[PDB]
Amino acid sequence: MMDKFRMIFQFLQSNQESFMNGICGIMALASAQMYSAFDFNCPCLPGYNAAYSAGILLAPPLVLFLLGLVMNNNVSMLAEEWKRPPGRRAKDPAVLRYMFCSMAQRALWAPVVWVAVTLLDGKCFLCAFCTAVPVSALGNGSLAPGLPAPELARLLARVPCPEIYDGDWLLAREVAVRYLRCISQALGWSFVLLTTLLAFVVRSVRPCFTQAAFLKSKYWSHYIDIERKLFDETCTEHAKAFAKVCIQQFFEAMNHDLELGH
Amino acid sequence: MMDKFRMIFQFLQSNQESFMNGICGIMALASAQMYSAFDFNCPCLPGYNAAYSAGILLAPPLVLFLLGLVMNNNVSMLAEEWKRPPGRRAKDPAVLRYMFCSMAQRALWAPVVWVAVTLLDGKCFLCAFCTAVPVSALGNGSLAPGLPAPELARLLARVPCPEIYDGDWLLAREVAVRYLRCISQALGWSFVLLTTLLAFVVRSVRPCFTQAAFLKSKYWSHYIDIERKLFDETCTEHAKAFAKVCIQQFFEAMNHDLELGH
Amino acid sequence: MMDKFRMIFQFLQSNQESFMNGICGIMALASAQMYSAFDFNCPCLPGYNAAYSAGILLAPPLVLFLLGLVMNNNVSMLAEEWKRPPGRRAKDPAVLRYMFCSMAQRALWAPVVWVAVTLLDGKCFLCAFCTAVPVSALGNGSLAPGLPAPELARLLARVPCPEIYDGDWLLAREVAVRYLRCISQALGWSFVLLTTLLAFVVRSVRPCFTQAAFLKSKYWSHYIDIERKLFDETCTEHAKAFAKVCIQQFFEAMNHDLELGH
Amino acid sequence: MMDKFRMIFQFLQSNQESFMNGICGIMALASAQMYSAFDFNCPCLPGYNAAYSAGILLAPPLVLFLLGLVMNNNVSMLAEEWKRPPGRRAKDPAVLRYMFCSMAQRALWAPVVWVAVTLLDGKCFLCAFCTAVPVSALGNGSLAPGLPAPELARLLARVPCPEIYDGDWLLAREVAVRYLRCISQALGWSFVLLTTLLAFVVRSVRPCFTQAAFLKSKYWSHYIDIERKLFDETCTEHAKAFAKVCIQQFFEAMNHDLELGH
Amino acid sequence: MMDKFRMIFQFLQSNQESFMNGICGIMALASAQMYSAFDFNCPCLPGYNAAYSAGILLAPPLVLFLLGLVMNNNVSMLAEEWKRPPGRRAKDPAVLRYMFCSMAQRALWAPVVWVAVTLLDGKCFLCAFCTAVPVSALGNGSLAPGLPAPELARLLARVPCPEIYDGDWLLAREVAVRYLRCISQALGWSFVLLTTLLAFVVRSVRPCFTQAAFLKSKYWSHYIDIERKLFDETCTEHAKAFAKVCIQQFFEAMNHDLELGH
Amino acid sequence: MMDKFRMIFQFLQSNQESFMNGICGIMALASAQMYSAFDFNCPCLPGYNAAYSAGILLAPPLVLFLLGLVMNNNVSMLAEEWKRPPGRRAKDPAVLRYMFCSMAQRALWAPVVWVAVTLLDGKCFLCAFCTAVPVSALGNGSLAPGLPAPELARLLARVPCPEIYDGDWLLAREVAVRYLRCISQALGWSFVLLTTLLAFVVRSVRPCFTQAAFLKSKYWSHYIDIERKLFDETCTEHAKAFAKVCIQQFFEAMNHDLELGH
Amino acid sequence: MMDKFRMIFQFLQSNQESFMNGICGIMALASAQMYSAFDFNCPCLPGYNAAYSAGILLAPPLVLFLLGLVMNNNVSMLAEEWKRPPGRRAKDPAVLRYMFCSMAQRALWAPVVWVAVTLLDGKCFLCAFCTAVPVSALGNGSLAPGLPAPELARLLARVPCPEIYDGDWLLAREVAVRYLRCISQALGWSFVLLTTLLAFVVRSVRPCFTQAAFLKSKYWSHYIDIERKLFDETCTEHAKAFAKVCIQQFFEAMNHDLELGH
């Protein structure tokens, strides 16, 4: 099971060449790996499955999203100037709208890797649709020998839980699995395809790439840096002149000498 | 079992990029790992469980909290100036109230990782509510064949202790477990979700972020640095002039020469 | 199974000598390895195979292609100046046609390694043509003992799925496999041969290597570098003169002194 | 068993950021690990246990304490000036009392880790109170079938020694153990809690933190450094002028030439 | 199986001392290792073997050859000036003939290591001549008990495929193998001997080592270096004077000020 | 089997202190190790052995010898000036005879380690003289019960091939082996002794150590270094003045400007 | 078996602090380890043992001795000036006698470690005196039941060869061994004791430590260094003036220009 995460492990061990997305690589690479040690096991009960599996395609994604906004050091400047009234805003809506949108496209670089990499291994999908398999399809001389609706859902639904499987009635194990891990791995490619193709279009066309506001932004965020870095200079400077008055008082103020004079 | 902690192990091995929270990463990453080597095993007795399990969601958290306050080098300055009377305080309540609050939000970065990572593996939860499972639910032709209340609590309660399990009466093992590790992993996500979302709000709104007092603080804590660093200069300086009087006395004072003169 | 990817692992661990193709080595080396942890298992059903196997020679290649264009920092400059009308284009078609073509030959350095390295292990090919093996050829006293067409496709088609194989009727297992992994490894060499030989011809002849336009290009892309790097200078410069007016206001504006004066 | 010590092993391998306590980390981290290779096995005899177990909670702690005082380079200066008569002491009782107390709180950082980490694994506690377990409690249809007092102590007392356990009379093995490793791990937390909370109070209040004597101390210990470092200068200086008189005598004093002159 | 390649692995790990051949060591060392992970398994059918084995002594060699020419950065200069007409060639045939020949003797340093290291392990040779072994030689009381020609080729030919071997008729397994891995390892030495001895003669005598043309060559290839390296200087220089006109326009052209003036 | 080569592995890993012999350590240390992965297995047939074993004490040595001459960068200078006629030789026979002899004593540092380290493990010797063991010596009640000459050579000769050994007739296995690995390890010491003792004599006496010609040599080989290193200076110098005429033509020759002028 | 040598392995891996003896540590540490991979197995025949075992306490020691003299770079200077006649010797007998003796005490630092470390494991001693064990001593109801002298030597002598041991007649195996590995390990300590104690005396007293000749020696050996290092200066200097005359001839002598002039 180490394969899905040990790969980025040496890849992390490989080099130190990246960007903000590589800074996102600090987190989401763990998201490529955090799946590995976090186990998965479904109740194999009659109706809980379709509830439970939807838990592991919506919450842990949404967590990794919101942990992207708070993680970067900008949201205050947008949060601060939004709550204030219009007019008083020292920034145009344009620089707001852009700079707000350039937070999403650095955060989304995670909640898409953790929806691929829990489809390609199918576990998330297996416990979610096993209740409705066409049992007549490849059923070893099938025909549903008088089987009812209840007490068959409890027959099908165990399929992922291996050692507690009921038996050969209208199914083997290795044909009900290994046919739901096929259909799953079809979505996993026909999903990641559509997303990356939609990564094309975005850059390639447009949405708030105006040469005007891009300039004002990068100027501004560059300006906050020099402000913080420079304020410390005056403090340490202005403080240095102030310590000399007091520290000297400790000297010449205990005994004006040492008793250890030989 | 190494997975839950070996992950941060190479992640620790990964790089050296962090902050005070990464300084908290020095500790709490161990808290992500300290769970790994510290075993867990419940009494599997009739009433001790619900006592014992609550031991491992309140004490070891609270320890990691208080080890956060004492660990950082500020509490004296707050502790010193609080015990003194008002008025004599060389600092406003504002700089107090802020600087005191900026100790919590650097300490809490632990006692939340050690409440997630002992819910997602369910062991802490399993030995805490096994005494009340609906045995009729998925009970292999159930009906409670005349079973009493006592001598059934001692029947259910063994469920986590594997090799000492009684038997198939109104239960298998792999259906009483693997249904309490489902419910548990639901809280683990629906908890960590709520917390991180509440990490949003805090930064994003406010609570003592006033531009006034933030300035006075960082100036002040910057000032203590130069004071300590500079005091050593005068000492080593003022001492150097003093050693010369005595060290010379050792010379010219033993024999004023060596007998080894050839 | 680690062999196919652990090789580039220490090879990655080996040194840091490469180029843009070695920059492509950042990705496609993973493509040499990403095969390793991504499992493969075919439905072993009557008609799905020839559908499913074609999934793993066209989609995951095409993904690695498009992830090559978006990955490098040029497509905007081509995308921007293409959408505009002719005439307004500040660049000749020649520099366009070349610079556009020099994106392909840096991207193709992947989708050819992931078509070799899933033929040489034959798994991709095995589940794709097992339905039509000449069963009379090496069939252990063959003759097709009255076998029909249906209920034989479901007999042959299981061949890759080992533990669910039907039996010795007109076949053993280790002669239907180990004869489709021969034919496969013949394409894998007679393919990689043809490609590399076609790598010869390209460099060796020509296609838009004109001394004229190559010059204009590398000059231009060199020019964008100095533009971005130099703009930051004026900002940090022009900003530094501006901070001094405000930062001083924070000083001398809170109390013009400290109450901590002893 | 490597877990309890292999953790600090990579943690030691982790980085080199610490202080005098981290200098104590040089020793006590071994004390976190020295437990690992030093085995434990109790006599499983009738009365020796409660003697023997108390051996491994008082001696090996007390050793690690005294190895803390001697390890640091200060005790002579306190030991030297204590044996002398009062009055002649070149240092106030205050600087004595403080500097003596600042030896304990750097030594205690060990003999508390080696009392936790031999309670949390319970072995030290198991062989110490097995002689008095309530056998009627969870005793598999108990009632003490005429059992005497002697020849039952020799029945209970074997409990830790696994392969030499007598048998099922009024006990199984896995219920007499796994109920004394519960009670133990309760002290281990309710102990380490109380200690760390008492680490709070100490810093937070007071005990000889007077601004007066802290100054005189750190000045003094700073002064001993420059004295030792500077004495070597005069020696190597004063010696250099002295060697020239003799070393020249070796020259011009063997033959005033070489016979190897060609 | 790691031995044949793990050797160069630490040897690669050993040091970084080599030349262009060591640059070829970048590739062919993999060719010493690429054999390791690329499996080998022959059809064990009647006539395909002698076809199939010849596949693995001619194609994968020839690939590693052509990947040597294209890999080095010279063939264009030879390819460019060859297609042109004579007379216009700015270089003598001598510098052509030499410089063309000094491409082979740096490429051949591979396709000879991958013909040794797939003879010394004999697998390539075993599946190629098993069809004609003298069965009477060491045949355990032989005499060919009426065996025909067909249905014996299918008897011999299985010999490498272990678990599918027919049986003891006129052969054991461990005497038909372990006599074809002897004859093979004789060629492997009597081949590598002849080649290295022919490496002697080449250097030691001659073939286009003329002092005249060697000079002109190394001068020329040295000249191309300074040309490319120096062209970038004029560009970045000539460009720097050009950016200042436009970048200033962005300044003073958005608002000529900031609205954030307090 | 890793022991014979894993030793030099960490020894190689040990340090980087050596000379030309240590440069030979680059190769022959592999020769100490190349034995490890190159297997050994003898035909166990009647007459081939004494042929085959002599293959592995003469060819692989002789290869490692000739790979020593070609490996060092001197043979051309000797090869070049030998083919020429006497008189024209710019070097005395003395400097020739010495410098030629100082190639052997740096090459022999291999083909002696690969004759020891395939005697001390005896495998090379076992398959070479098993055909003539005195079977009466330690033969478990011997007497040769009417055994003929043929059909006994095929009885003895199998002795190294373990699982195909015939049986107890006039021999066990572990007394025919373990008496030919004794005699072998006697030569291995009484050989390496004689060689190293002959390493004494050589240095210690003489053979072309004349102070005259040693001087001329090391001067000469020192001179070739400065010649090659210095020639590159004039080229890069003389070329630099030449590029400026052409590179400027590319500028001012495409458009004398850019169309991108805004 | 790795223990005897893996120890110095990490000890070698430990640090790089040593001297000429540590330079001897380069070799003899291998001698501490070379025992590990070099196997040992005695003939277990009637009279060869006492011959064979003496082979492994005299030859491999004596080899490591002579490999110490030749290894260091001094013996020529002693060998050269000894063969010459007295009087012509440019060095006194004293500097000879000392400098010759200071070769032994750096060589002996090996052939004593390889006589300890093949006694403490007893294998060398076991196969050397098993022929004469007092069989009556601890002989399981002994009395020598009519056993003869011959056909008992062949009974005792097998004792080290485990699987070929005859049987229980007048002996078990684990009492004839495990009583000859006791007596052996007694010599191993009572030997290494005597040697190290004799290392005391040597330094502590005397043997050619005269202040006169020690001076002349270290001066002399210091002088040879500067001679060799300085000779290279004049060569490279005197050569540099000489190359300029010829290298210029290559220029201006091929064509006095290039045909590539455009």
Residue numbers in the entry:
A (entry chain G), B (entry chain F), C (entry chain H), D (entry chain E), E (entry chain A), F (entry chain B), ...: 1 to 262
Q: How do the authors describe this structure?
A:
Calcium homeostasis modulator 1 (CALHM1) is a voltage-dependent channel involved in neuromodulation and gustatory signaling. CALHM1 is the recently identified member of a large-pore channel that permeates ions, including Ca2+, Na+, K+, and Cl−, and small molecules, such as ATP, in a voltage-dependent manner. Furthermore, the ATP efflux through the CALHM1 channel in type II gustatory cells and the subsequent purinergic signaling has been shown to facilitate the perception of sweet, bitter, and umami taste sensations. Our studies here showed that the human and chicken CALHM1s have a conserved structural fold, oligomeric assembly pattern, and a phospholipid-filled hydrophobic pocket for controlling channel functions.
